[PDB]
């Protein structure tokens, strides 16, 4: 993936939605987070007030 193309020289930088994890920090230099997120819930809002 994109982390592979940086350790193997096939790319100079990777700008994409890449999850900042520990296993990736040991091989790459991750910048500060430009977009905070987390696990959320998705439901179909009713639409049932017939």
């Amino acid at each position: 993936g994109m982390v592979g193309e940086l350790v193997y020289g096939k790319a100079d930088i990777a700008i994409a939605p890449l999850t900042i994890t520990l296993v990736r920090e040991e091989v790459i230099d991750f910048s500060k987070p430009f977009m905070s997120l987390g696990i959320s819930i998705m439901i179909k809002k009713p639409q049932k007030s017939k």
Partner: protein
């Protein structure tokens, strides 16, 4: 928020790698839940549920 270390310090990178280890092991969320909701004197959860 973040942990600050002097530039060029020997503890700069080892501490940064330790922070990500605590976030993925659920330690940071466990400590956040400790000194906010566990040890919190929240009376609204008992006064609003009567």
């Amino acid at each position: 928020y973040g942990i600050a270390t002097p530039k060029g310090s020997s503890l700069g990178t080892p501490v940064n790698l330790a922070v990500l280890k605590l976030s993925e092991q659920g330690v940071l969320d466990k400590l956040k839940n400790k000194w906010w909701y566990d040890k919190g004197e929240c009376g609204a959860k008992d006064s609003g549920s009567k």
